[PDB]
Amino acid sequence: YLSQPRLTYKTVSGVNGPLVILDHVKFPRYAEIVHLTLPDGTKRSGQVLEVSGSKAVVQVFEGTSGIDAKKTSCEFTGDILRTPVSEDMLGRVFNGSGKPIDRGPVVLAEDFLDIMGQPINPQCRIYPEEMIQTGISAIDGMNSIARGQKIPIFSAAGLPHNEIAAQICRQAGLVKKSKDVVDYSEENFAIVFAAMGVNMETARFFKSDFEENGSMDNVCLFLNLANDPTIERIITPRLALTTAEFLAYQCEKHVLVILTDMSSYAEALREVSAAREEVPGRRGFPGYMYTDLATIYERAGRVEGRNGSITQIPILTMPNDDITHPIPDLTGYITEGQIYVDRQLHNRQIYPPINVLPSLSRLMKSAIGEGMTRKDHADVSNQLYACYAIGKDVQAMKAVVGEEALTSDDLLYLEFLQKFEKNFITQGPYENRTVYETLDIGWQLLRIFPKEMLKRIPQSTLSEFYPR
Amino acid sequence: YLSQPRLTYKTVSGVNGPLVILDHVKFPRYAEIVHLTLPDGTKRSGQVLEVSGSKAVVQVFEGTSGIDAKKTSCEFTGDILRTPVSEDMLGRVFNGSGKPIDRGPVVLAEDFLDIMGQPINPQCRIYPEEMIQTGISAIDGMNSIARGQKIPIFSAAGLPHNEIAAQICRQAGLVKKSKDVVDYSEENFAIVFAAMGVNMETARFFKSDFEENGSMDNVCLFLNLANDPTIERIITPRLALTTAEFLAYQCEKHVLVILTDMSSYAEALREVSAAREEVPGRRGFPGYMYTDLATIYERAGRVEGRNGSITQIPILTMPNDDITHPIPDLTGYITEGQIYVDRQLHNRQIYPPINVLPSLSRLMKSAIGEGMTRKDHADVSNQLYACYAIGKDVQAMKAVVGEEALTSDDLLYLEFLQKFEKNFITQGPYENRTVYETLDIGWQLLRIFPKEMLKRIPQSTLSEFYPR
């Protein structure tokens, strides 16, 4: 460990927006933390990014203002960024920089960890099999998820995704309720939440919701407003992810990370790239943002020899309700699945307006079946899905021509669409439904058709369950 | 004559991408050829691309690899690439750079000519007057080609254009048999087939089919596999054009040159453009594609005081059915007329899939007529086109209306259409077809109808074959 006095320089050679270029620094370190002292005396921090001979550049996490070519000092610790982390972080609140904001004490660290963390060896990773209860009807049964499974939430401006996040974080539970309840109740879910580029109103809505739940015994909150500087957002997610790693792989608990507004992260990275004059990719975003999103989306899954788990549940906004926009596409190439909250459903006041049609959850493949959830599950979702798609086709054909050309089968499809939207989609504010109930509701929605119409269902299962 | 010994250097500042930058070059010359030597005694070649006083630049053909700062040597030849052009290559095969691949020796050429070539006197050009025998009924009957006429062949990726080209190679001839069999003994005809960027499988297909046909006494096969150097791709067409000009003019021949996959040629042009550090133009292709493609296309025609002609037939791989793509647009602009193929006909298992409805030959009216051939060929093609159009139209009306409202003449049109794709369009792989018997077949098809509705042809010429 380092056992030498710190070092200080004063040669400042320019400021280019959120960057500060400087000269005559001996033996610097790439990715090294720098402190700053202003003429007025305030303190600041930064990160060395570029290095070339004696000249080096940094990035002030809180912007540049009042800096001077000769009346500002800088200090090089000659060490990679080491963050503090303890189990005591539960129940606390902080800003992006990690300093307290809720009047509480300074951080009292249990250990120093690396911001970049480390690349986990894939062989230790245990493939998830548990299927987590969500309470939501659209996610359970149809696009379910697992413990350790990283799923995003696609949404847009003005959509009510915030309370969807509230619901999914509040109604967390396990679906293995068919056994003794006492051993079931031992399990809880530590939550770590990292606001980022989020206005005051949504932040207070979330903290009031958490206070209503009374779950601050196991909630860590990192906060960011709009008025704060922008470059904090470059490092804000990583702090939360590292703390989640420590709370999972060392404290043995089950953690659930929440990330907010990744398009803001992309915007901040693009701003840094615009300052850094590197080669721009499509829509001006740097080429290596793919690898950056990879590095921030891989800290998930459980590991051998332990029993904790890490589930990634980010939310991101699509400008102009676009799907081929860069950030949605690249996130689709990193994350395994999608949800696609839709504006059209929200226009007719259906809450939550979850569009099942473009959704996907690959890891449903082995997360369901006899013993896990129910003998007869997947084909029900497939039949409902194909019926929904064909019903939407019939709806389009009705729009093009009119009800005159529709057959009786088309009428059956249309009433299926109506009932499907009315019952299965619409749930309500705090309607915590069970898995068996949603399966029963699916069977109910299937009942309207006779045996002949269904095509993607085994006849044995139909004879087993349909006649009741 | 070059009486100046060659110069070999050893100093080099470095290299850059696939190029090679050195210094202290005594009197560099643009487009100068050079050989290279590696530490392990490996020999390569190159061409000079940029010059600035003593700082020369050269692209290595084989591909930069294992190059050392000091233990490498270049050796200038002091001259642009010099084609070993001559008459005796017929019956030989060469690779990209002309090195023999048929187990032959270095060509003992009697002439050394510039690879790039020169333009022709626009004053010295003749109007084409005869036709060329192709052997495909759909080609000669509808869109017969002339001496000097330039016709491309549009085709989608994954169609049997290559096999059609090979058939045209092994089938193309003259039409002197019409005047007299004895006159055909003046076999001045020749073929020059150049394939670029083609998978080894179809290159083997070409060479095996040629060797089977046993007609390489009048063939010049250039071949360039896909894995070969990118630079050599833009070299082969110039060599082929030089040899074709030599045969057609200096050896008074009638040479049918054919070129394949100019889309990949455009990609090679893009490669060199990227190497040139010139900003790309529309759709990424360089803005000077026009001049290069024009210099490639225009090397043909007949000349005064000469007995010979050149006829070019390129094959363009239409990207994803995009008529508005720049390459096909400009190729249509330069050349005269076009011929289309169809995916649906290929799906119908009718070979060759040639669509004559949009096909058009520019100057067919003078390529055909009495004296050159039978007098009423153009009349017959016009009749077949009009009848095909009427048959397609009545079939389209049919498909929604019904046979209940169909008249006998329309049944005759349907029969003619069906027999037409069954027989005339259908060719088969090894069916040597001549113009006279194709005319007989067309007459037999036309004889299904009486004279009443065969209106477009005067009766004075209908008496020639209708009453048979």
């Binding site: 004059e277 | 550090e277 790309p280």
Partner: peptide, 18 residues
């Protein structure tokens, strides 16, 4: 195209530093 032109010019002027 404009963005690529701008960065190419930037690289060029950087090249003529000496």
């Amino acid at each position: 195209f404009y963005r690529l032109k701008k960065i190419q010019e930037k690289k060029k002027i950087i090249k003529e530093k000496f």
